[PDB]
Swiss-Prot record, chain B:
Lineage, top ranks: Bacteria, Pseudomonadati, Pseudomonadota, Gammaproteobacteria, Vibrionales
Gene Ontology MF terms in the entry: 1-deoxy-D-xylulose-5-phosphate reductoisomerase activity; manganese ion binding; NADPH binding
Organism: Vibrio vulnificus (strain CMCP6)
InterPro entries: DXP_reductoisomerase, DXP_reductoisomerase_C, DXP_reductoisomerase_N, DXPR_C, DXPR_C_sf, NAD(P)-bd_dom_sf
EC number: 1.1.1.267
Protein name: 1-deoxy-D-xylulose 5-phosphate reductoisomerase
Reactions mediated catalytically: 2-C-methyl-D-erythritol 4-phosphate + NADP(+) = 1-deoxy-D-xylulose 5-phosphate + NADPH + H(+)
Amino acid sequence: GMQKLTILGATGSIGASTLKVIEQNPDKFSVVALAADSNVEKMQQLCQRWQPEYAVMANKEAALRLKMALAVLAPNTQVLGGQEALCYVATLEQVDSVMAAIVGAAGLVPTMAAVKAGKRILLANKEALVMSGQLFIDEVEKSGAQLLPVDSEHNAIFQCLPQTVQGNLGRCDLASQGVSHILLTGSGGPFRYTDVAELEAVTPEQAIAHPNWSMGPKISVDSATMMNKGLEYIEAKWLFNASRDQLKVIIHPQSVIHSMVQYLDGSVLAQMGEPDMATPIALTLSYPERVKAGVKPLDFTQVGELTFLQPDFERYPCLALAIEACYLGQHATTTLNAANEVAVAAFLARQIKFTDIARVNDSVLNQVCKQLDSLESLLELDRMARTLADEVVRERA
Amino acid sequence: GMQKLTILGATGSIGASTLKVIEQNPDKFSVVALAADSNVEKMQQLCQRWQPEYAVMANKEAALRLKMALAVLAPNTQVLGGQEALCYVATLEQVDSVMAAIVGAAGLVPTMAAVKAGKRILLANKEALVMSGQLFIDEVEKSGAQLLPVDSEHNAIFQCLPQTVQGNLGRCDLASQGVSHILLTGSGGPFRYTDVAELEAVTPEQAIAHGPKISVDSATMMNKGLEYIEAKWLFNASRDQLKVIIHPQSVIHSMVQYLDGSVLAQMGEPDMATPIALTLSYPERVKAGVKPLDFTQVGELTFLQPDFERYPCLALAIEACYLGQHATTTLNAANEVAVAAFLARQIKFTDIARVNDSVLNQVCKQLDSLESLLELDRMARTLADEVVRER
Ligand SMILES: [Mn+2]
Ligand SMILES: [Mn+2]
C-alpha cells in the first residue's frame, strides 16, 4: 500500500534524488513532510510542487518567512520551526519511512527520534553511526525500527548480502549465513598512484580534483586521505555487525563496483551502477521490492577497464587510524571525526600541509584515550576534541 | 539433515569438483551412488575412496569389469549396469539430490527420471534444456523437483537474482520482481580480437587450448548460444530480458540488471566447486575448498558488445532459441556434425555456421517427446552430413 514519507534535509542533493524517485512512482509514495535548514526559496518551491501536510525549517526565522510564503502557494501546508518540530515530523503516526538526510551533528536528535518511534530509517547521516553506533543499534532493537542505508557503499553491501542478513542489520550473524567477509571499496583518491614522498607538498587545489560529479571540499579531502573510507568502515561495522575478521578495504579506482561480499564457498557478489544516488535511495524506499528510479541501465560498452589496488598505510594513515578507532568504540570514533574536521579546515586554510592532517588526528586521538553514553556526552566530547585539535594546529603552523 | 547424493557422471571434472565439496563437508553430505559410462579405472579408484552403496556403469561390459575389480577394492559396493540402473540410482528413495552430469543425449532419460521422482537436480547436462526445455520445465512443476543449475554462468545469474525468483525457476516473473536484464557473459574465445576476414583460414590447432568439440564451440560462441537457450528456460526470459556481454577475463561469471539501475555480478576463482557447492547447499552456504578471490591477481576487467559477423553461431542460437525446441534441437544436432567436419579438415572454420544455417532453414521451412526429439536429432545430423561432403 501507499508509503508515507518525511524527508529530513529536503533541499540538498540526497533530497532531490529522493524526490526524483518519488516522482517516478506516484502511486507508491507520498510526501507527508519536508524539512530543511534555512533555504526558504528552495523550500517554498518544493512545497509548491509537493504540497506537503508539513514543512519544517530548523531555523525559526526561516520558518516565519516560509510560513508567510506558503499561506497562498501551499495553503494546506502547516509550517513549523526548530529542532522540536524536526522530531515532530520524524515521529508522526502516519509516516512509514523517514529519509534521514540532515548532515552533521544537527541530524542526530531528529534521526534518533525517528528511531525511537520505530520508523523505517533511510539513513543518510554519517554521524549517527560514526559518533554513536552502539547507541543507535540499541535503540533500533528496542523500537523495531528498520535501518536501510543510503550511502552508496553500504547500500551495495546490503544488496550483496542474503536476505536473512538484510533483515537483521545491527545484529547480524555473518558467519552463520555464509559470509566470510565484506569488501568495502573506494577509489583511492587523487593520490592513488602518487609517490608518498610527494604528499608533504600537496595543495588543496590538487587534493580537490575529483570526478565530474562534485563533492563538498571537506569530503573531497577525506577521499584524498581515505578518511572517508575509514568513516564508512566504522559505519559498516555497526550496520553489519562485523568482527575484525569480517570487514576489508579494497581500492577500485573507477568506482563502477560499489562494494562486494565474499561468501564461504568462494562466491563473490558485487553491486555496480551508474553514479546516481537515486539507485541506492530507490531500494531504501522500495525494499524488498524494486522500483523505477529514473537512472539509466549501466552500459558495459562505456565502462572502461575495472582494476583493483592494494591500499597501504604509508599512503593512507588516516585509514589505519579509523580502523583502529573503530574497534576502540564511540569515544574514539567521536574523537577522530571531530579532530579530522579541524585538520581538514586547517589544511584548506593553508595553515598546515596535507600530510599534517593525519598527525593532528593521531595526537588528538591519543590524548583522549589516555584519559553511560548519550548524544550530549558525545557532543561534549566532540567539542573537547575540536579544542585539542585547534591547539595542535597552532603547533604544526 | 544429512544429505544423500547420487552422482551421475562421476569420472569427469564436474564429478571431481562435486566430490571435493563433499570431502570438505563430511558432516552434511553422503554419497549413496556413483555412476559413469565406461571409465572403469577411474571408477574403481573413486569407489575405493568412497565405498558407495551403489556404483553404476552405463556400459554393461564396463559394469562387469568394475564388479570384478570392486570385489577387492570395495566389497560392500553393489555394481550395476545399463541405462535402467542409472534411473534406478537417480530415483532411490533415500536420495535427496542428484548431480546430473552425464553429458550428451545419453543423460536425458536418467536426468528425467530424477525429475519425475521429485529430487533436487543439480543440473549439469546441457541437452535437457537445449533439446527439450519445455518438457523438462513441465515435468519439474508436476513433481516439485527443485532445479539448481551447475553451469558457471547460470549459477552466477541465480545468485544475482532475488530469492522469490530463485525459488521459481522455469516459471519466474522477472519484470514483476524488478529484473530488466540478465547479462550472460563469456570470454569471446580465441578469436575475439581477430579480424573477421581471417576466420575463413582458421585451423583446428588455432581453435584449441586449455575438450575438442567444446573448445571449438567456445571459438564460435555456439557454446554461449547453447547457454543462452538454457538461460531462457531456467529464467523464463524473453529475448529482450536476456543479453550477451563479452568479458574476456572471465572473473565476472554473469550479471543481473535491475529496474532501479542496480547491477549484481557474481565473481570468483575459476573452480566449479563454488557453483556446485551452492547447488548442494542452497539456501545455505558451505566450504568448497576454493580460496577467496585474490584481487591482487585479477588484472583489468573489460567488456565488449559481441559482433554477430564474428559469431554467427550465436545469432543462430539466439534466433533458434525463440523459434522453439524443434529449432534448438536441430541447431545442436547440426553443429556436432559441422564441428567434427571442421576437425576432420573437410571444412573451413567459417563453414561451421553455414552448415548450421542451411540445416536449420530446411527443417524450419516446415505433441513433443524425448524420442520425437532424438529422431529429429538424427534427421538433423543426416541433413548436416549431406551438406558437408558437398563442400
Ligand atoms: Mn562513498
Ligand atoms: Mn561456459
